[PDB]
Write an enzyme that holds these catalytic residues in place. Structure first.
Site, short mmCIF file in Angstrom:
data_model
loop_
_atom_site.label_atom_id
_atom_site.label_comp_id
_atom_site.label_asym_id
_atom_site.label_seq_id
_atom_site.Cartn_x
_atom_site.Cartn_y
_atom_site.Cartn_z
N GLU A 173 6.48 4.05 -1.05
CA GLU A 173 6.48 2.70 -1.67
C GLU A 173 8.21 3.01 -2.38
O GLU A 173 8.50 3.60 -3.05
CB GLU A 173 5.91 1.92 -2.56
CG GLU A 173 6.29 0.87 -2.47
CD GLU A 173 4.95 -0.26 -3.54
OE1 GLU A 173 4.92 0.51 -4.84
OE2 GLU A 173 4.32 -1.40 -3.52
N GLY A 177 4.45 5.94 -12.68
CA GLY A 177 3.22 6.55 -13.01
C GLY A 177 1.97 6.96 -12.56
O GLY A 177 1.40 7.28 -13.23
N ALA A 178 1.80 5.69 -11.69
CA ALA A 178 0.64 6.01 -10.88
C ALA A 178 0.98 5.11 -9.12
O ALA A 178 1.99 3.79 -8.48
CB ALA A 178 -0.58 5.47 -11.51
N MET A 179 0.39 5.77 -8.48
CA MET A 179 0.40 4.99 -6.59
C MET A 179 -0.62 4.04 -6.09
O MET A 179 -1.48 5.37 -5.60
CB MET A 179 1.40 5.58 -5.56
CG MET A 179 1.94 4.92 -4.43
SD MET A 179 2.28 3.25 -4.73
CE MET A 179 2.13 3.05 -2.80
N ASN A 218 -1.74 3.43 -3.22
CA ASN A 218 -2.38 4.75 -1.57
C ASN A 218 -4.33 4.11 -1.03
O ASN A 218 -4.95 4.87 -2.20
CB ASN A 218 -2.26 5.98 -1.75
CG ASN A 218 -0.79 6.43 -2.26
OD1 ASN A 218 0.31 5.92 -1.40
ND2 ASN A 218 -0.96 7.21 -2.57
N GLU A 271 -4.43 -0.02 -10.83
CA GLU A 271 -4.38 0.57 -9.11
C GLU A 271 -5.30 -0.09 -8.76
O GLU A 271 -5.34 -0.75 -7.86
CB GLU A 271 -4.10 2.18 -9.87
CG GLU A 271 -2.78 2.22 -10.45
CD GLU A 271 -1.79 1.33 -9.10
OE1 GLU A 271 -0.56 1.49 -9.99
OE2 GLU A 271 -1.82 2.04 -8.50
N1 LIG Z 1 3.09 0.47 -7.05
C1 LIG Z 1 3.93 1.27 -8.30
C2 LIG Z 1 4.83 1.67 -8.31
C3 LIG Z 1 6.03 2.53 -8.25
C4 LIG Z 1 6.95 2.51 -7.41
C5 LIG Z 1 8.02 3.65 -6.85
N2 LIG Z 1 6.71 4.48 -6.97
C6 LIG Z 1 3.03 0.66 -9.37
O1 LIG Z 1 1.40 0.47 -9.48
O2 LIG Z 1 3.28 1.15 -10.04
ZN LIG Z 2 1.64 -1.62 -9.11
#
Ligand SMILES: N[C@@H](CCCC[NH3+])C(=O)O
Ligand SMILES: [Zn+2]
Ligand SMILES: *[C@@H]1O[C@H](CO)[C@@H](O[C@@H]2O[C@H](CO)[C@@H](O)[C@H](O)[C@H]2NC(C)=O)[C@H](O)[C@H]1NC(C)=O
Ligand SMILES: *[C@@H]1O[C@H](CO)[C@@H](O[C@@H]2O[C@H](CO)[C@@H](O)[C@H](O)[C@H]2NC(C)=O)[C@H](O)[C@H]1NC(C)=O
Ligand SMILES: *[C@@H]1O[C@H](CO)[C@@H](O)[C@H](O)[C@H]1NC(C)=O
Ligand SMILES: *[C@@H]1O[C@H](CO)[C@@H](O)[C@H](O)[C@H]1NC(C)=O
EC number: 3.4.11.-
Length: 869
Positions: free
Chosen positions: A144, A278-280, A282, A315
């Site tokens: 992302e 902080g997290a992803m 996926n 998440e």
């Molecule tokens: N989707 C991520 C943000 C990451 C943005 C940069 N990889 C979240 O829940 O915080």
């Molecule tokens: Zn998010």
């Protein structure tokens, strides 16, 4: 026009042509973690809608070494392709020997190769330290929003969804994970293994994930049968117990609340050593920083438990908000992140009401408000182009504001109706994209009198800033005037749902507003009224006349007569209006008297914050006499509660957080006894050689105290490398940030540059920590300004890292002098520098600072002295 070494480009737009639509990727990656790179091949089942000569998709730092189009009808296996790389758009065009035909399914195939990344982006390389002092390597993806293309060539827009079939080749020493479960594992010739994974459901490219590593897991099943597993370095499997419990409770709640099952057989959560966000989210394989997922009771405090609970919840909520239903493009990124940011509240309040995340959530809201009261702010929804632009889109606005205007909306509409609202929305776009307007349209429709909620939320998402609602009270009429709130324009209006209460009945009077001005009549003349109850709404209220004075008296006479969120809110708005010029600093400062009666830690903690803040303004600036008086005022008042606090970990969450809060303030103010206590605990802990157990709540404190002696700080640092706890390390690092020796701080910054002892991922936070101390505010600013080049090697701009490395070291400035050096530095950043919206904001913020001072500094001085007397 075009490149690279000749010829021209069929496409002059950074968006991709809708003509070539992908339906399925067959993707195969063969990484090597000694070689430190990968080979791969892919196979894309396109489908054309308009005949065309060329096929256009994304690629970045990928060496392509075979390209073929195959035929289902037409041409048997297999016609060759002409590869055209246009890097400035991170695109490559394919050249066909013959026009393609509408309405038929083709197969695009390429072999490609690269080294694993240096970054925290694309298909990168990360490492960790074992209990035995061994350094090990893993390979991992983070896509992302626009780095999916750095791994395999593909149509890298959130809209082009598809099924992905992923195959990974690996030595036996390793495991391979990816979004989906694992069908089979065939042994290849000379030992090497190959894993086949379940074809994914339809989903965007940014959600593809795959990892090779040698972590261990802890597995369990949700009531509806998903295999939740927690993954992490082998020596850390014990820290993964809570992650499991929570994941589980949480996925259950989500499936029920959303009334939509989680589609996948399993869900994985893994603790990545080097991880930027902080997290992803996926799908089926969510990645976390260790601090966001691991927990060790010996070393992790309450706020910790709360934080990781938060992010785990945040998440899982994406599995629905973003994963299942994806915003069509990056301008509505808020749809994913704002909604996820909000659902945190619901689910955590649901599953773990003992964390009382409720009394917290407001802070999310306020903190954004601080940023949304500047001209350099923006709307939740805003158009996005360059990858960089998009990266900026991930900010306090898309997240918190979006999350805040949702809970507000929910208030107007009611949980019952709101909850219904989303089950519809989610079900409607399952496995597809959705627009900004789509959300509202599906919420507002949850006779024949029509929900016009649309118009309302439309003014919210589409214009910058936050509303200030001033009220005038003449007996039984109240003049409600609205304005844009700013911190020292024209053309703004908000369909702003009002609320309020009266001294008499504690009943909630609602009333919507859409005209610039309106009036309202009160069923009985009354003492005070209070707009925005529980602070459940995104705006500020000013009280002209005796409106403010009335409420403040009430606070000193019988504050319980006021909602503890109203209490909390009043405190916010009071102090904010001082900056807004509307009020004088003494009025706020005065409210802060009743605090000796305040037992609602939320309000009590907020109050102190503002107090504690001015101390830090005063302290940075040499301004002795005031900082010294404010120190004395804080130690003196509040000394009862301060003296009540235990160096234990007992009591509720708020109780422990308040303790940590207080005991910290005390020690940070050099309170003779408190710092003796800490210095003792530390000296026991050190001289016992770690054996002694310092309570997690005073942990950060004791460490930072012990850090003042050169002996301690050296033991803390060595103890840092040896710690199997990211959380401890975190606290240790902070404690190392509290030294007064320039060289000592400088060291840290270097160690973080190197990234061996102190992971690069900590560099921003670290810098920020130092910048705040009087001693380090210069060191820090020198360093960033002097190293912007090498920093920009390490991180992307604008990564949250760069974005925070910039503001963290400068946003706290409040002199004319510095506002220049910063202003001038940002001019300088203007090559690969320019441009970040953070450049703006930071300036505007420094200015606001300078102002507040001249405007309200002297006022603070007297107020304090008035107390001394
Ligand atoms: N989707 C991520 C943000 C990451 C943005 C940069 N990889 C979240 O829940 O915080
Ligand atoms: Zn998010
Ligand atoms: C990556 O390449 C390494 C080369 O270091 C491979 O390990 C070698 O593999 C061959 C055949 O498996 C052996 O004869 C060598 O003895 C290996 N070297 C070492 C240090 O053991 C490894 O197979 C590759 N990894 C993968 C899965 O592609
Ligand atoms: C690709 O993904 C879809 C799901 O995203 C797979 O299945 C369809 O899924 C929808 C939504 O759950 C169901 O309503 C359909 O019944 C499914 N269709 C079929 C035929 O199973 C789909 O099978 C996958 N297709 C590919 C290319 O493998
Ligand atoms: C939080 O959950 C409780 C039930 O445990 C519920 O009564 C309350 O209204 C919820 N708070 C909000 C505002 O979501
Ligand atoms: C507020 O203060 C009064 C006077 O001290 C006290 O009796 C009372 O407990 C409070 N009011 C109530 C009953 O909530």
């Amino acid at each position: 026009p075009v490149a690279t070494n000749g010829e021209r480009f069929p496409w002059q737009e950074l968006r991709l042509p809708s003509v070539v639509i992908p339906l399925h990727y067959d993707l195969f990656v063969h990484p090597n973690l000694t070689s430190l790179d990968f080979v791969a091949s892919e196979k894309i089942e396109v489908l054309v809608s308009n005949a065309t000569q060329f096929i256009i998709l994304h690629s970045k730092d990928l060496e392509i070494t075979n390209a073929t189009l195959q035929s289902e009808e037409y041409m048997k296996p297999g016609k060759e392709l002409k590869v055209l790389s246009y890097p400035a758009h991170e695109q490559i065009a394919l050249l066909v020997p013959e026009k393609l035909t509408p309405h038929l399914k083709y197969y695009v195939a390429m072999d490609f190769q690269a080294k694993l990344g240096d970054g925290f982006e694309g298909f990168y390389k990360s490492t960790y330290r074992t209990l035995g002092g061994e350094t090990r390597i893993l390979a991992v993806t983070d896509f992302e929003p626009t780095q999916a293309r750095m791994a395999f060539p593909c149509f890298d827009e959130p809209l082009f969804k598809a099924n992905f079939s992923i195959k990974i080749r690996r030595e036996s020493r390793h495991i391979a994970l990816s979004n989906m479960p694992k069908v089979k594992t065939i042994e290849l010739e000379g030992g090497l293994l190959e894993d086949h994974f379940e074809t994914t459901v339809k989903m965007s490219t940014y959600l593809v994930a795959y990892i090779v590593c040698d972590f261990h897991s802890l597995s369990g099943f949700t009531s509806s049968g998903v295999k939740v597993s927690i993954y992490a370095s082998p020596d850390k499997r014990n820290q993964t117990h809570y992650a499991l419990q929570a994941s589980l409770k949480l996925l259950d709640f989500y499936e029920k609340y959303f009334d939509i099952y989680y589609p996948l057989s399993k869900l994985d959560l893994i603790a990545i050593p080097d991880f930027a966000p902080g997290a992803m989210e996926n799908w089926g394989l969510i990645t976390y920083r260790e601090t966001s997922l691991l927990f060790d009771p010996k070393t992790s405090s309450a706020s910790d438990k709360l934080w990781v609970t938060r992010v785990i919840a945040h998440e899982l909520a994406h599995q629905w908000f973003g994963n299942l239903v994806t915003m069509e493009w990056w301008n509505d990124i808020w749809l994913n992140e704002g909604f996820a940011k909000y659902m945190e509240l619901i689910a955590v309040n649901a599953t773990y009401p003992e964390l009382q995340f409720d009394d917290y959530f407001l802070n999310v809201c306020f903190e954004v408000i601080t940023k949304d009261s500047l001209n350099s702010s923006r709307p939740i929804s805003k158009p996005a182009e360059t990858p960089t632009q998009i990266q900026e889109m991930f900010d306090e606005v898309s997240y918190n504001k979006g999350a805040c205007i949702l809970n507000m909306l929910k208030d107007f509409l009611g949980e019952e109706k709101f909850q219904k609202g989303i089950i519809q929305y989610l079900k409607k776009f399952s496995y597809r994209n959705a627009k900004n307007d789509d959300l509202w349209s599906s919420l507002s429709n949850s006779l024949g009198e029509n929900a016009e909620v649309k118009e309302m939320m439309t003014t919210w998402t589409l214009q910058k800033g936050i509303p200030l609602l001033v009220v005038k009270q003449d007996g039984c009429s109240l003049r409600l005037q609205q304005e844009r709130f700013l911190q020292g324009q024209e053309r703004y209006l908000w369909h702003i749902p009002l609320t309020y209460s009266t001294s008499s009945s504690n009943v909630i009077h609602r009333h919507i507003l859409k005209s610039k001005t309106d009036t309202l009549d009160l069923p009985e003349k009354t003492s005070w009224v209070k707009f925005n109850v529980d602070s459940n709404g995104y705006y500020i209220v000013h009280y002209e006349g005796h409106g403010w004075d009335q409420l403040i008296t009430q606070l000193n006479q019988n504050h319980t007569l006021l909602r503890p969120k109203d209490r909390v809110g009043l405190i916010h708005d009071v102090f904010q209006l001082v900056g807004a010029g509307r009020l004088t600093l003494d009025k706020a400062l005065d409210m802060t008297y009743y605090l000796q009666h305040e037992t609602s830690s939320p309000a009590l903690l907020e109050g102190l914050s503002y107090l504690e803040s001015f101390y830090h303004m005063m302290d940075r600036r040499n301004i002795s006499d005031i900082s010294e008086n404010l120190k004395r005022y804080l130690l003196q008042y509040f000394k009862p509660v301060i003296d009540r606090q235990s160096w234990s970990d007992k009591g509720s969450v708020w109780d422990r957080m308040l303790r940590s809060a207080l005991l910290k303030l005390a020690c940070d103010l050099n309170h003779a006894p408190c710092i003796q206590k800490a210095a003792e605990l530390f000296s026991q802990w050190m001289e016992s050689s770690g054996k002694l157990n310092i309570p997690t709540d005073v942990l950060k404190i004791v460490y930072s105290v012990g850090a003042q002696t050169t002996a301690g700080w050296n033991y803390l640092l060595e103890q840092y490398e040896l710690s199997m706890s990211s959380a401890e390390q975190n606290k240790i690092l902070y404690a190392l940030s509290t030294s007064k020796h320039q060289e000592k701080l400088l060291k840290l910054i270097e160690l973080g540059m190197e990234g061996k002892v102190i992971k690069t991922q900590n560099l921003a936070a670290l810098l920020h920590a130092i910048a705040r101390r009087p001693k380090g505010q210069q060191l820090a600013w020198d360093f960033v300004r002097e190293n912007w080049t090498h920093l920009l090697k390490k991180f992307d701009l604008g990564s949250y890292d760069i974005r925070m490395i910039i503001s963290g070291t400068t946003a706290h400035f409040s002199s004319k002098d510095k506002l220049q050096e910063v202003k001038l530095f940002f001019e300088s950043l203007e090559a690969q520098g320019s441009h970040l919206d953070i450049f703006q904001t930071v300036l505007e913020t420094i200015t606001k600072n300078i102002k507040w001072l001249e405007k309200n500094l002297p006022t603070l001085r007297t107020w304090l002295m008035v107390n001394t007397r």
